[PDB]
Amino acid sequence: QCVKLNDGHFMPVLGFGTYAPPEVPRSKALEVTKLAIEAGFRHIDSAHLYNNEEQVGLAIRSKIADGSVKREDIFYTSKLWSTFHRPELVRPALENSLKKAQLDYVDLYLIHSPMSLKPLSPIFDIVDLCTTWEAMEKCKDAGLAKSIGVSNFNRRQLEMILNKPGLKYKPVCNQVECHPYFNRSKLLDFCKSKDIVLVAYSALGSQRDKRWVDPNSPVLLEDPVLCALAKKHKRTPALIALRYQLQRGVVVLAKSYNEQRIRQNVQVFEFQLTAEDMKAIDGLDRNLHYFNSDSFASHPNYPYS
Ligand SMILES: NC(=O)c1ccc[n+]([C@@H]2O[C@H](COP(=O)([O-])OP(=O)(O)OC[C@H]3O[C@@H](n4cnc5c(N)ncnc54)[C@H](OP(=O)(O)O)[C@@H]3O)[C@@H](O)[C@H]2O)c1
Numbered sequence: 001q002c003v004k005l006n007d008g009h010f011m012p013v014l015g016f017g018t019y020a021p022p023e024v025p026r027s028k029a030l031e032v033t034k035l036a037i038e039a040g041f042r043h044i045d046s047a048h049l050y051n052n053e054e055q056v057g058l059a060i061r062s063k064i065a066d067g068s069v070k071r072e073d074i075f076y077t078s079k080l081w082s083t084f085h086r087p088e089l090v091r092p093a094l095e096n097s098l099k100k101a102q103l104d105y106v107d108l109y110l111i112h113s114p115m116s117l118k119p120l121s122p123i124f125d126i127v128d129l130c131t132t133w134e135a136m137e138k139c140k141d142a143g144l145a146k147s148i149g150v151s152n153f154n155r156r157q158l159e160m161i162l163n164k165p166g167l168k169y170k171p172v173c174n175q176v177e178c179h180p181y182f183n184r185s186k187l188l189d190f191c192k193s194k195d196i197v198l199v200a201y202s203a204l205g206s207q208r209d210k211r212w213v214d215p216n217s218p219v220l221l222e223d224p225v226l227c228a229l230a231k232k233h234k235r236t237p238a239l240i241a242l243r244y245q246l247q248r249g250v251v252v253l254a255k256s257y258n259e260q261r262i263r264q265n266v267q268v269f270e271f272q273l274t275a276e277d278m279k280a281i282d283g284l285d286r287n288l289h290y291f292n293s294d295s296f297a298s299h300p301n302y303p304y305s
């Protein structure tokens with residue numbers, strides 16, 4: 001249940017999202033990530049910004065120790081935060097992440113966002129990200145990351161890397177917000193044309209953080225069409241939203257800190273949607289990105305409109 005990447009490595013098509021707001025204790029990320037691996041998750045999504053890499057690393061190592069999984073069976077992702085985009089900071093930031101997680105390599109390292117910040121939430125900065133990508137390329141050559149990609153890149157920002165003079169490695173993936181209300185069908189078409197995997201976050205709609213998400217926005221999992229399809233298939237609305245991405249070639253993440261819902265989310269491989277189901281879901285696209293805050297929308301390299 002993996003997809004082959006542009007650089008030869010493989011990525012599991014269902015990933016586990018580990019972000020919890022700072023009010024959730026970090027000991028939960030350790031328990032939860034162990035349960036995700038117990039449930040069948042082999043793709044685990046973390047980042048510098050998430051303040052959990054020590055716990056997520058320990059969880060992986062703990063399951064490696066108890067004879068459940070081997071390191072080569074786990075796909076660990078980290079992300080370079082936007083205060084570290086200047087090239088001389090890229091490798092130290094990655095080495096720090098491996099340090100926190102106590103791992104020898106990450107399977108995937110991403111530029112978290114194209115919106116550079118002053119060298120964690122400072123003020124904007126102006127960085128030529130082709131130089132940041134060059135430092136990413138060296139992290140792959142050095143073996144600190146098996147694969148390298150980007151996150152929150154729009155079409156123009158992706159093209160800049162692919163058009164870079166003397167590019168070494170193209171981005172393996174682009175991790176963007178993607179769900180039935182914001183399905184990125186044009187960006188998905190472009191990524192499939194360049195052999196770039198689209199990885200979807202907020203596929204269950206969001207954690208609806210009051211910092212960045214308007215509480216007046218519709219709740220994706222309460223959508224009428226998704227709920228009717230859940231009743232039709234005798235599944236849950238979350239499983240329909242996840243199966244929707246797998247059937248259109250999108251690697252999908254799913255955060256859950258609930259034992260029961262983590263186990264339920266791996267049932268996405270058990271059933272299929274029909275062609276009629278898929279256009280029902282495609283008709284829900286309404287250009288609604290849940291993350292909508294002036295802090296993002298004021299940045300010069302803001303990927304949206
Ligand atoms: N690159 C980026 O900029 C970026 C941005 C955002 C997120 N991400 C990553 O993507 C991951 C997922 O995105 P997300 O944080 O927005 O969370 P999400 O995957 O969209 O899930 C949203 C909510 O759905 C609930 N849920 C999980 N399974 C469910 C189920 N079977 N039925 C009903 N509800 C269910 C969860 O609540 P419970 O916990 O109570 O189960 C969760 O809080 C993140 O953890 C992060 O790793 C990356």
Ligand SMILES: CC[C@@H](C(=O)O)c1ccc(-c2cncnc2)c(F)c1
Nearest residue numbers: 019047049112113152291292296303
């Ligand atoms: C902790 C929150 C974090 C995450 O969960 O990864 C996150 C969430 C949203 C964005 C983002 C990017 N580009 C446009 N709008 C929003 C982001 F860069 C980073």
